[PDB]
Every structure is written in structure tokens, then in C-alpha cells.
Amino acid sequence: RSLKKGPFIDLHLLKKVEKAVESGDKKPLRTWSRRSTIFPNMIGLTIAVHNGRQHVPVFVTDEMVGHKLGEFAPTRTYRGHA
Amino acid sequence: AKQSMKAREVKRVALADKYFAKRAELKAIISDVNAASDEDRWNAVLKLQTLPRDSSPSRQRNRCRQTGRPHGFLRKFGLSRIKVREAAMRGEIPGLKKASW
Amino acid sequence: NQYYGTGRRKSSAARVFIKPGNGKIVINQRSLEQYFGRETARMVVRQPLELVDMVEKLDLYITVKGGGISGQAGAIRHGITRALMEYDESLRSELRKAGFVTRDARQVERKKVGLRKARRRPQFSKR
Amino acid sequence: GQKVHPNGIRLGIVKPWNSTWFANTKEFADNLDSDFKVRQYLTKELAKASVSRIVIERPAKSIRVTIHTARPGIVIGKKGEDVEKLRKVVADIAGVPAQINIAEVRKPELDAKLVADSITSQLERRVMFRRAMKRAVQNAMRLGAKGIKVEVSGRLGGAEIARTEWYREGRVPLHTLRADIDYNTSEAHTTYGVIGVKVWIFKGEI
Amino acid sequence: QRIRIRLKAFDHRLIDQATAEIVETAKRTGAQVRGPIPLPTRKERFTVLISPHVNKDARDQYEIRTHLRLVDIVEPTEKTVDALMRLDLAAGVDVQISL
Amino acid sequence: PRRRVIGQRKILPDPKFGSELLAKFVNILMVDGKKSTAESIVYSALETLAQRSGKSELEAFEVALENVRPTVEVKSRRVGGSTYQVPVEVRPVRRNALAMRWIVEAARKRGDKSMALRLANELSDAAENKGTAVKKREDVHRMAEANKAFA
RNA sequence: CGCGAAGAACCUUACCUGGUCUUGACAUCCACGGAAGUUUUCAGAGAUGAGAAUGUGCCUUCGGGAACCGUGAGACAGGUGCUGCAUGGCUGUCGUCAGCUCGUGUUGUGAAAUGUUGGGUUAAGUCCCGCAACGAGCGCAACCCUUAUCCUUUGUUGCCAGCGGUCCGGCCGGGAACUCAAAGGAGACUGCCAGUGAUAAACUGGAGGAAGGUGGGGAUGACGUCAAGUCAUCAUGGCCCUUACGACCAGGGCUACACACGUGCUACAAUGGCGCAUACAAAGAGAAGCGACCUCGCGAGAGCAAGCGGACCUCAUAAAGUGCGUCGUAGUCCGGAUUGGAGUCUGCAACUCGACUCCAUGAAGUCGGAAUCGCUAGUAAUCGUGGAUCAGAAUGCCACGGU
Numbered sequence A: 001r002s003l004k005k006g007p008f009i010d011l012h013l014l015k016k017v018e019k020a021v022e023s024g025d026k027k028p029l030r031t032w033s034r035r036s037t038i039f040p041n042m043i044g045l046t047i048a049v050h051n052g053r054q055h056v057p058v059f060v061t062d063e064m065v066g067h068k069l070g071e072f073a074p075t076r077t078y079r080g081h082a
Numbered sequence B: 001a002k003q004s005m006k007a008r009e010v011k012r013v014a015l016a017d018k019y020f021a022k023r024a025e026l027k028a029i030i031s032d033v034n035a036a037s038d039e040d041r042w043n044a045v046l047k048l049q050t051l052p053r054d055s056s057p058s059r060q061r062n063r064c065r066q067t068g069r070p071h072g073f074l075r076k077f078g079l080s081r082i083k084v085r086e087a088a089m090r091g092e093i094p095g096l097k098k099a100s101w
Numbered sequence C: 001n002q003y004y005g006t007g008r009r010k011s012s013a014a015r016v017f018i019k020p021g022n023g024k025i026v027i028n029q030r031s032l033e034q035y036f037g038r039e040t041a042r043m044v045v046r047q048p049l050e051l052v053d054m055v056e057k058l059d060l061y062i063t064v065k066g067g068g069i070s071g072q073a074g075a076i077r078h079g080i081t082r083a084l085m086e087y088d089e090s091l092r093s094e095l096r097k098a099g100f101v102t103r104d105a106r107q108v109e110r111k112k113v114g115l116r117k118a119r120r121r122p123q124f125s126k127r
Numbered sequence D: 001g002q003k004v005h006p007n008g009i010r011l012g013i014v015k016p017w018n019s020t021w022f023a024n025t026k027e028f029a030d031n032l033d034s035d036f037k038v039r040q041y042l043t044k045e046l047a048k049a050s051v052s053r054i055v056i057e058r059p060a061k062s063i064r065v066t067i068h069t070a071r072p073g074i075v076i077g078k079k080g081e082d083v084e085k086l087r088k089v090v091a092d093i094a095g096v097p098a099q100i101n102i103a104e105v106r107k108p109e110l111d112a113k114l115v116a117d118s119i120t121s122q123l124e125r126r127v128m129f130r131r132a133m134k135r136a137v138q139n140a141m142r143l144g145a146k147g148i149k150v151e152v153s154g155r156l157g158g159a160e161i162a163r164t165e166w167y168r169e170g171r172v173p174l175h176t177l178r179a180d181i182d183y184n185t186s187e188a189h190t191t192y193g194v195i196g197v198k199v200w201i202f203k204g205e206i
Numbered sequence E: 001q002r003i004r005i006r007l008k009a010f011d012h013r014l015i016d017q018a019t020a021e022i023v024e025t026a027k028r029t030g031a032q033v034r035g036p037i038p039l040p041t042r043k044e045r046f047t048v049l050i051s052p053h054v055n056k057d058a059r060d061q062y063e064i065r066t067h068l069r070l071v072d073i074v075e076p077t078e079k080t081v082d083a084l085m086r087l088d089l090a091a092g093v094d095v096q097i098s099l
Numbered sequence F: 001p002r003r004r005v006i007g008q009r010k011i012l013p014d015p016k017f018g019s020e021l022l023a024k025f026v027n028i029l030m031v032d033g034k035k036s037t038a039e040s041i042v043y044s045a046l047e048t049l050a051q052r053s054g055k056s057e058l059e060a061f062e063v064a065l066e067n068v069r070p071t072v073e074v075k076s077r078r079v080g081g082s083t084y085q086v087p088v089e090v091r092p093v094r095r096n097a098l099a100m101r102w103i104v105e106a107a108r109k110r111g112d113k114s115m116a117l118r119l120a121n122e123l124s125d126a127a128e129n130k131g132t133a134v135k136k137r138e139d140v141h142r143m144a145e146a147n148k149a150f151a
Numbered sequence G: 001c002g003c004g005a006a007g008a009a010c011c012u013u014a015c016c017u018g019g020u021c022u023u024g025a026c027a028u029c030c031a032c033g034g035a036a037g038u039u040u041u042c043a044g045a046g047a048u049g050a051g052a053a054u055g056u057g058c059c060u061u062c063g064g065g066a067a068c069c070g071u072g073a074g075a076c077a078g079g080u081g082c083u084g085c086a087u088g089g090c091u092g093u094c095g096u097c098a099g100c101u102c103g104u105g106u107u108g109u110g111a112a113a114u115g116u117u118g119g120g121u122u123a124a125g126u127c128c129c130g131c132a133a134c135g136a137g138c139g140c141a142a143c144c145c146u147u148a149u150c151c152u153u154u155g156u157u158g159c160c161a162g163c164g165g166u167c168c169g170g171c172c173g174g175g176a177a178c179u180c181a182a183a184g185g186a187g188a189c190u191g192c193c194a195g196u197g198a199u200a201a202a203c204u205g206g207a208g209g210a211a212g213g214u215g216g217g218g219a220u221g222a223c224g225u226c227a228a229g230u231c232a233u234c235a236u237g238g239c240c241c242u243u244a245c246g247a248c249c250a251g252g253g254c255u256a257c258a259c260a261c262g263u264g265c266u267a268c269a270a271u272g273g274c275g276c277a278u279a280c281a282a283a284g285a286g287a288a289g290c291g292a293c294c295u296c297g298c299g300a301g302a303g304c305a306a307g308c309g310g311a312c313c314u315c316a317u318a319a320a321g322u323g324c325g326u327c328g329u330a331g332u333c334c335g336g337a338u339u340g341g342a343g344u345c346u347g348c349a350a351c352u353c354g355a356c357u358c359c360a361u362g363a364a365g366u367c368g369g370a371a372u373c374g375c376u377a378g379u380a381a382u383c384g385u386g387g388a389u390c391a392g393a394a395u396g397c398c399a400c401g402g403u
């Protein structure tokens, strides 16, 4: 829980979103920035988020705002023991 | 300890005093509340990230000065725990004798 | 005139002044019932003046420092005997058999490396 | 079992420190490291000058190095050229101006460092290690020592299995704290690996 | 006004001949001296593992003692001030003057 | 022990009465070094013996101690692979030590509210030769004259 | 098996995926061109990519010299790659167990023996007698550190007995008595005495003494054993890789989770829980730090901000304890795991994966099968405090005192 004086976002994601919003969407937007906050400006976009080997496409719903981008890309492969 | 690991420590320390301990103003008093509470602080939180990923005093590992060991460090001597014993028995650390209480 | 004694216990130190004639016990500018809440501590300061009968016959001015409740009370009892032996010089062999002249030299043992306490060893398992 | 270092247990009892300076916590690690640099340089340069001990002492903000040596005429040189081709580089490593002084070890055969360096040079020259060992024990007892022990370790004569062989003469009471025991260590680098040498020399009590 | 001089060293024999030389020397030119005062001895302690690899319970414990002596001079005559500056004592003794 | 054989260590008397058997009783009750809390239970329980069931305060504790004292005990004595239970005469300092432990351990497994009341009823039950501290004493004496033949 | 690791979000980091480099991230030498350094710019996740503004110092053989940069090529650099069964150094362990050897002599064809065995005694191969052994060395003990008593010196930032004053605060003059600080000295040696023992050693007991039989605790680990541990702290022989097993970067992982084991913490309550009031410590740390007073916040904390490189200032309010009240044996006013919401701080960054605060939630657990561990006195048990590592992050570790 970061303090209330400023939410965090990268610069390269912040600028790549704002250009991509004023053109209609696209490809899924490749980023490595798992730590950046999803903003209100990004509802509707598709962001391909790195998880270690792949980029998981996340379509931003309204209720994903306020969370971090890395919450919607699982970094660990696991399915049972036996 | 793998020569290039010794060079990482000496680059990090040169790039931190290049920028920081002077270019701390962006977080020193730009991120505290007065008339600078407008978009100027928001320009600081973004401008503080385009300085290189190094340059911060919290990425220095503080290795031993002779062997480069990352663990067992003692800030008082600058050596690892191996080198302080190897050098204390020869009488070269001043005043450092075996304690018995 | 005052007759002075120094007594010490675990980490406590007591200074003791005695003046002829009263049953006044004052310790750190407090009386005994206000200073020592424990009646065992109340009864170990009265031990050397109950063996030697100077109960309403000798005043006592006491200061203490350091240690805790029972440590400070034992340092006083040792310090009263040293003061009463400067006063008379012949209450000595009366007090040696009461064990009040021996300075109790039992101190806390230091914690040792590899051990959880001074002597308690961590739990061993065969495998 | 493992033994205590006989020099460290006697520091402040009969053995002095090799550094005699004071510092707060600010400049302790810099004075300690720069003394490592000045010691490493003086050992490499006075290699065949038979150097026993390097005593470093810092006044207010100068440093002065006292070198105990067996061959002082070579350390000073011809005209006094190599004491200040030594002091313009020591003062550049310590950061403060330097004043080199030069001492004497009168009998190098009763110094554990010099006796240990004699075996290491001979072991790397392919000399039988026993004669190197027994000559060091013999030369020390004829010069008045009350004891000596030498010890070599590791792949002796190029053998595949390493062994440690030691030879004692006189009296070396390492458990006695009053004993003036001079102990030092050296390493020989041969074509089959490293051979370590240890020398204890006992000179009397108190 | 009393000039106050604190001496710090790792050795107590070296520190006493540093006190003895400044106790010698203010009285050389006629000053009030109180003499030397022992300040409390600071012991720093250190506890290292002595194996290169495991064995947590095998250790060595080292310490550094720092000995303190205090002498104040409240006759600072002007024969004293530079005559106190011309004095050569040992390299193991830290002197710090302060008014 | 084999070699270092011991003298004794000294106990202080009690403050209110001046008895060390009473002070040994507070030591046996004490848990985790809390000596002041053990005297509070021991003092409050003994006067609540006095006017509930019969006077002479400290005379009543010694007489309750007279019944729980054993005289014989069993002890195992090994021969070559066979251990007999041999009945032993218990010594007078061991008599009080076993009696006070059985009183304290009787009072802990009761159903009263406080510990000072559990102590008071077990000391009262010992005066009437009833309870569980007396029956702990009875089982020791029953086993001893059961193995009388292995003397 | 809370072990290397005295402290993995990035870093550390050695692992993975992807993006990149090939005399190199680190060192020497040669040649040429540029003194450097600074601010800025757009691309890229970043390493890097394409430039602008600027400087053109100090030495001057001022044909040039040293610091620093770029480019080329070569010898080379580089490896936390393998072998601890090729090694050094260092360490564990039996074990702080009382042992382990040698010289000369003598006995035996000889491997070997004697000494070192025997009678006593001791913690001790400790000491005394005896004896084909006479002596010596490494161990034992002592010398060293700390603690317990006293004496001398000095007396602040530490102290307050006698005095004067007081705001009744050691507070102010003052005192050097006392506590205390740290240098020096004394003291314990079976020294004295009874008894027992072989005219022995030595043992039991007594006196004096603060302390009595190595007074308490520490450091000190003999010859060797386990081809014990460590090529990964370092060093190093051999082997192997070299436009890669080397170097740079972003994100991830070392924190996974049917399960099994070790070491711990917190509990299952009344010798207690909660509420109010109030006592008595030692020892440590502090300058890109410790941070008072005051103000704001329920709180973690925020603002302002003096003092302190410290017997002075700060961390820093010791807790168990004591007095009063309540709960009245309940899955409880016991327990505080788990989860939801709102926050604070460190830091480019708190999603994976930090600590702490507030409100709510209120699991298991009612003393634990077979088995098994520690401790002989200021010990066990119980209760708080500090430190290293460290931006932040201990129930671990290393220390300190109370009962």
C-alpha cells in the first residue's frame, strides 16, 4: 500500500497509453511494466503483460482500476500434484 | 567473487554521487505538502524515474573490500568475517584483541 | 556521630548512615512501608537489628541504587551490619554466625554462544 | 583438533600490534584498507630484500612505515635512491605523506618469517624437503633458541596423497601465555600445488 | 577560562604518558590543574563465525577498548597556549581540545 | 553424584511465623519464580483454615502434615536382569518433602475457584484423613506391605 | 536441517524466458584521433541507437607529458565451470578426555618391551614411595580476562555526608566524605590447628576471613581419528568453455504445495484476562545518524525542530511486582489464526513478495499416543531491554539485567 501522495505508473506505459487512446485500439500493447497502476484512462484497452516468459493479454474492465497490472498475469505455473 | 561483480559495485557508487546527494531535491522537498502540491509534484514523481535505475543508495550491496564477499560484512572494518579474523590474529587491526568477560 | 557502611547485592548498592537513638528507618527519603512493598524485603532489613537489640535504640539513614526489589533489600542488610560494626567493634562474632557479614557474591552468569541461556542447551535429536 | 593462533592470543601480553593508529568509526575502514595496500606493495617490492615485519604508525594525518629487514643495504640502495622511490609511492597509496624507516633483524635465523621464507624458496627450487626442514631446526638451536618447530604440508615430492611432516627440537609451550613464541606462515607454489609452511620459535618467558 | 582536553587511545599505558606530558607541561608554566580524570571505558564487542562454511556454534569474540582521561586547565596564560601546541606525543593517542 | 558430594543450601524462615518448613511449603507451591504470589495463596489459605475449622493457625498445619507423612516407600533394586520392588524406610527430611508435594498436587486438581481456596480445603481434608492426598499416601503404604516379602 | 545466509521486492543473484555484445563489464602494452567534464534531445522495457549545446584545464621536451574518452589488431582478460578422493588456509568431532611420545641404558633372534607398571592419593601421567631404569618433550596446573573485599591517587559531564540558601529540582555556593569512574597496590597459600595415614603425599574437620580447598565464569582444544566440511570467502595443480560455461539489460524465480520431518513462537486460562494508579535495572548504539520540547492525528505517524561525534544530548515510558475494581470456570471478557475494508512509512517501485496501525471477523486449541530433550544455584523456570546485519524487513542470533 503506497502512500496517498501519488499513485505510481511508469513513464513509457503512461505515454504509450495516451497515444493509443486517441487512435482507437490496436494490437495488444506490449509492456513489461507489471508494477504500474491501471488508470481510468485505460478502460477498453488491451495490454499484453509479461509474466516471465509470455505476455498475457488483459482487457481492462472498469473494476480493474486501482489495482496493479501484475495482478492480472500469473507468474507461476501450477496444476495439481497427483 | 567473480570480478565483474566487483565492478558493479564501483559503477553503482560512482553513478549515485553523480546524481544523488545533489539531485535529491525531487524527493527531498518536492514531495512534501505546500504550494508545490500541484502538478509540479506529479512532474517530480515522473521525473525521478528517468534517472537511471542505478544512482540510488539502496542498490549498493556493501561487499568486503578485499575478497568481495556479499555476506558476513562488518561496517566497522570494511572486511568480511573471514578477513577480520585472518587480519586480527596477525596484529594488524589496531586494538582488536580477544574478548574475555 | 554517623557510622557508615557499604553493602551490596546482585546489582544493588546501599549506603547506610546510623545515628544514636530512634526507631526511624528512612530509605531514599521514603519510609520502609512505602519503599519496600514486599514484606519479605521488610523483614530482611529488620534482621540485623532484631538479633542485636537496638530497635528503639539506633536511627538509620539509608540510600540505595541499582538492581531490583530483593536485590536492594539484601544490599541494605549487608550495609547495616557494616555500620553497626564500626559502632561497637564487638557485635562482630554475634553477626558472623547470622551469616550477615558474608557478601553474597552470586552474580548472573553470562549467556554463552551455542546455548539458549547461561546453561540451557538447545534440544538435541538423534536423527 | 584446531589450535589457537599463537600470535593473536598474546597480543597485549607479550606481543605488540603491527599497527599503532587511532580512528573513529568514520575513517577506520579507510585506514584499515589503505594499510592493506601499503603492506601488499612493500612485500612485492622488497621481495628478495628479506623483510620480516612492516610496522605502520600514523601521527595527526601522516603515515610512517617501519620495515624490519635482514638485508638493509639493499632496501636503502646505492646513494639512497630506493627509499624515496619507495616513499613517493607509499605516500600515494596512503593519501598522506610518508616517512619510511628501516630496522634490522640481527639474526634472521631466529625469525619465524625469514625461516619460513627460506623453506618456501627451497621447496620451489626442488630441494629435498627434509634437509630444508632439518637445516632450519639446526640453525636455530645453535643460535640460542630454547625451541623451534617447523611443519610442511601437502603433496611432498609430488606425491598424489598429501601428508604433513613436522620436526621439533627443544621446547615450544603454546599453552603458556608468558612464552615469547614467534610464529609465522608461508606458502610454496610448486608444479603439483601449494605446500604450506609453519614455524614456531621459542625465545624465553616474560 | 578552563581549556579542556580529552585523550582517546586503545592502550592505557600510551594514554597515561600522554596525560603525564600535558600534566607535566601546564604545571611547567604555572597553571591550575585538576589533573587527569578517568572517563568511562568504552568496550566495543564483536562476534564472528570462524569457519568458512557451516558450523554456526563455533565462534570467536573480539573487542576494542577505548580508554579515556580528562584534565582541565583553568589558567590559560599565553606562555601556555603555544607551549601547549609545541608538544610531540605519541601516535596512538588522540587529543581533542575544546573550550 | 559419584564424586562431588554436597552439603546443604539454606532456606529463609517465614516472615509471619519464622518457620522454614512453612517456607519450604511456599517454595514447593511457587511457579516460575513468582514467590510473592505463592505467599499470598499460602497465607490466605491458612487463616481460612483457622476460623472455618479450628484454631491454633500453624499448629493446624503441622497436624495436617502428620497424617500425609509416609514412613515406608517402595524402591527398585536391580540384581542381574531382575528388579524387585523393595520396601524402604523413608527418612525424616524426605517425609516432609513427599507430604508437602502431595498436598500441593492434590490442591491443583480440584474444582474450587481460587488456588488459595483449593489449598484450604485440601488441608482441611487432610485434617479429617480424607481427600486425595491421604489416598495418595494410602496407595504408597498398600504397595509397601504388599511387597513385604522382597525385603 | 533459525546451517553458509550478521537479515532474497529491484540490487544481492550465482537460476529461467526474452532482448543484446564479442580484446570485452575487470588489467597491462602499441597506434591514431579527441583535454575532460556538463546540459539537452527523440526512439527503446532497458541495455543501447541518432544527435545538439558546451567546454579546448594542468604540464609544457611546450614536435609533446600525465589524468579521461573513442576506434583498430594482437598477446590476453574472464569462468559462483568439474575434481575437498590432487592441495593450502581455516573449521567441526571424539574431548578440556588425560593422555601421547622421545633420548640414552637394559631385556628379546625379532615384531616389540621397560620407562608410562605396582601401593596410596588427586579434577589431573597430580604428587609421594617402590622399581632396570635414568632423564626429557607435547598435554595437566600456573602465567591471561572478568567477578566477589580492602587500601592509595585523581574528582567531571559522575556524587551529596557535614554546612549556608531554596522555587524545596542536587537546585545554587560549596565539600572530596560516600556511591561511582579507572590506574596502581594488598589479599587465599592447605597459610594456621586438631585428627587419620607408611618418619610420606594426602585426606576429613575447625579458626580467622568478603571469599577455603582449581572461590564463580571465560579464553586456552595435545599426538591423532572421520580421504569429516569448504575448489562458493580466498589461494591453487590438472582438466574443460572462449563471437561463450564469458559480459550488459527488463521481467520472473529462490516465497510454488496432496504430503513428511527438525528447531522455535503463541496458546489452551483464575498462580489468570481486562481497567485505573504507582515502584525498583544493567548493558549497548548514534552524523548522508540518534532525534527532546511543542502542534496535528484514535493510532502507525506528519510538521516544526534544539541538543549530541556523547558519565552531559537522544534512543528510552523496563516488565514481571504492589493497591483497588470487574469477569466466576464458560470455547469464556481464554485464544488471536484467518479474511474484508480504510491507512502510514522506507524505497525508482510494496502485484507476485515488506513491516506496522485502525475498524470489523473471532478458526483450531480444554494440557497432547508410542517415543523423546535440557538443567546441580543466582542454575532451571519466568519477565523485560539492547546490538550486529540493515533504506525498509526477527518468534532467529549475540549480549544485559529483574524475580
Ligand SMILES: CN(CC(=O)O)NC(=O)C[C@H](N)C[C@@H](O)CNCCCN
Residues within 6 Å of the ligand: G367, G371
Ligand atoms: C506441555 N506440558 C503439558 C503438561 O503440563 O502436562 N508437558 C508435556 O507435554 C510432557 C508431559 N507432561 C510428560 C512427558 O514428557 C512424560 N510422559 C511420557 C509419556 C510416554 N513417553
Ligand SMILES: [Mg+2]
Residues within 6 Å of the ligand: B001, B002, B003
Ligand atoms: Mg577471483
Ligand SMILES: [Mg+2]
Residues within 6 Å of the ligand: B058, B059, B060, B061
Ligand atoms: Mg540493501
Ligand SMILES: [Mg+2]
Residues within 6 Å of the ligand: C108
Ligand atoms: Mg537471565
Ligand SMILES: [Mg+2]
Residues within 6 Å of the ligand: C122, E056
Ligand atoms: Mg543454533
Ligand SMILES: [Mg+2]
Residues within 6 Å of the ligand: D002
Ligand atoms: Mg577453537
Ligand SMILES: [Mg+2]
Residues within 6 Å of the ligand: none
Ligand atoms: Mg536482474
Ligand SMILES: [Mg+2]
Residues within 6 Å of the ligand: none
Ligand atoms: Mg532478483
Ligand SMILES: [Mg+2]
Residues within 6 Å of the ligand: none
Ligand atoms: Mg539469454
Ligand SMILES: [Mg+2]
Residues within 6 Å of the ligand: none
Ligand atoms: Mg574458479
Ligand SMILES: [Mg+2]
Residues within 6 Å of the ligand: G084, G227
Ligand atoms: Mg575431505
Ligand SMILES: [Mg+2]
Residues within 6 Å of the ligand: none
Ligand atoms: Mg580441509
Ligand SMILES: [Mg+2]
Residues within 6 Å of the ligand: none
Ligand atoms: Mg561433497
Ligand SMILES: [Mg+2]
Residues within 6 Å of the ligand: G097
Ligand atoms: Mg581420548
Ligand SMILES: [Mg+2]
Residues within 6 Å of the ligand: none
Ligand atoms: Mg627406547
Ligand SMILES: [Mg+2]
Residues within 6 Å of the ligand: none
Ligand atoms: Mg638385543
